[PDB]
Amino acid sequence: NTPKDQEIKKLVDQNFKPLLEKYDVPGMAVGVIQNNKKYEMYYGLQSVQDKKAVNSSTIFELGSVSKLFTATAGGYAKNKGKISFDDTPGKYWKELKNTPIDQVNLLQLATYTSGNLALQFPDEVKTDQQVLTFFKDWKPKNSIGEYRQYSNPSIGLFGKVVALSMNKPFDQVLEKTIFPALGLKHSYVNVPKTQMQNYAFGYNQENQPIRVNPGPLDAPAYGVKSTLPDMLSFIHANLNPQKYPADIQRAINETHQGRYQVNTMYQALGWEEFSYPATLQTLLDSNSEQIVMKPNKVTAISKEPSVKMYHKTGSTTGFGTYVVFIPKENIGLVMLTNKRIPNEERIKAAYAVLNAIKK
Numbered sequence: 450n451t452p453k454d455q456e457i458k459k460l461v462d463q464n465f466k467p468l469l470e471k472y473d474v475p476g477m478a479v480g481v482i483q484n485n486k487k488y489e490m491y492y493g494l495q496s497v498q499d500k501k502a503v504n505s506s507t508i509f510e511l512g513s514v515s516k517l518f519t520a521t522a523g524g525y526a527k528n529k530g531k532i533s534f535d536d537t538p539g540k541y542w543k544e545l546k547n548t549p550i551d552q553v554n555l556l557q558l559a560t561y562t563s564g565n566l567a568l569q570f571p572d573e574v575k576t577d578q579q580v581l582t583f584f585k586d587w588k589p590k591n592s593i594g595e596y597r598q599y600s601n602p603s604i605g606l607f608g609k610v611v612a613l614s615m616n617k618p619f620d621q622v623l624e625k626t627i628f629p630a631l632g633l634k635h636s637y638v639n640v641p642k643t644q645m646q647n648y649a650f651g652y653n654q655e656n657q658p659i660r661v662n663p664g665p666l667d668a669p670a671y672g673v674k675s676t677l678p679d680m681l682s683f684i685h686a687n688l689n690p691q692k693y694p695a696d697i698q699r700a701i702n703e704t705h706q707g708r709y710q711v712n713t714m715y716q717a718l719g720w721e722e723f724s725y726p727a728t729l730q731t732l733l734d735s736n737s738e739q740i741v742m743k744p745n746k747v748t749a750i751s752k753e754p755s756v757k758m759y760h761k762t763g764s765t766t767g768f769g770t771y772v773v774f775i776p777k778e779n780i781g782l783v784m785l786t787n788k789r790i791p792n793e794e795r796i797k798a799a800y801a802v803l804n805a806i807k808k
């Protein structure tokens with residue numbers, strides 16, 4: 450006896466709204482798409498000092514959810530014949546030819562199995578020449594392809610090679626090719642001056658206003674900004690890839706293909722993948738310190754899950770993101786905040802909402 454849009458708003462109020470007070474978060478956007486119908490819920494302020502309300506135009510930093518766009522770009526290049534995932538980086542970045550890193554193939558870079566690449570570049574690697582020197586100085590540790598360690602330099606180098614194969618800077622690969630193909634008109638690597646008024650402040654742990662700073666290969670690792678409507682469209686594209694031209698369709702499907710497992714988690718291209726229904730602990734394990742911060746030996750996929758779900762967390766110093774979608778339920782959810790909150794809370798809140806929505 451209650452309209453569906455009110456039912457979903459109530460669920461988001463019950464499970465996401467309390468996080469605002471609990472973590473002193475200034476602003477939040479939550480969206481649900483179910484059976485091609487979109488539901489948008491905005492809370493709080495995109496700028497505290499300006500008393501500017503979060504709304505459909507608010508631009509948030511996606512953090513590592515940006516890696517999903519990097520993976521789509523690589524899937525696009527691969528299916529256009531510009532790269533093979535068996536290639537090594539020196540085929541495209543010629544100065545890496547005959548260096549040790551040129552023994553690692555593009556899939557291994559994209560899925561974090563070089564065997565010796567940490568979460569971040571060293572603090573002092575900043576310039577283009579310093580990034581090149583860092584990879585020229587790279588030497589193997591663990592056997593290549595056997596150990597997963599979540600790594601910005603790893604997928605950053607993949608993104609750089611994808612851009613080289615397409616004869617464009619990476620920011621242009623997204624803003625001129627991939628965002629238009631996905632129908633995203635309010636998504637940016639670099640937010641233009643004409644849109645800065647819509648760029649939220651992020652807020653650090655002292656609730657001080659901040660925004661992301663430049664860093665090495667930032668764009669492919671964590672450098673996309675977007676709005677809730679654009680992120681719901683992105684979820685829509687992942688739920689309905691057969692509604693895009695052949696090259697973009699195949700690119701999206703590329704990001705859904707599991708490549709190896711670490712226990713219950715399947716590493717796809719950018720996306721993390723799970724058998725569905727997934728237990729809460731399966732989803733929480735994917736965010737454990739053991740999985741996120743340490744190397745873990747990988748194993749071949751044994752059960753290729755017919756029914757599955759995908760998710761990805763992302764953070765910058767001042768923003769939190771979570772995206773999740775379940776193809777066979779034709780449903781997905783996006784959470785954007787301009788303050789970080791624990792990944793476990795994002796996963797729990799989305800799990801409660803998605804399981805409670807009437808089918």
Ligand SMILES: *[B@@]1([O])OC2=C(C([O])=O)[C]=[C][C]=C2[C][C]1[N]C(=O)[C][C]1[C][C][C]([N][C][C][N])[C][C]1
Nearest residue numbers: 512513514601664670671762763764765766792
């Ligand atoms: B990305 O968001 O993935 C990620 C997660 C996750 O998946 O939620 C958790 C913890 C770290 C990471 C790394 C990715 N995000 C960043 O790289 C953050 C970025 C790093 C450079 C800046 N350096 C300032 C250090 N105070 C901070 C923002």
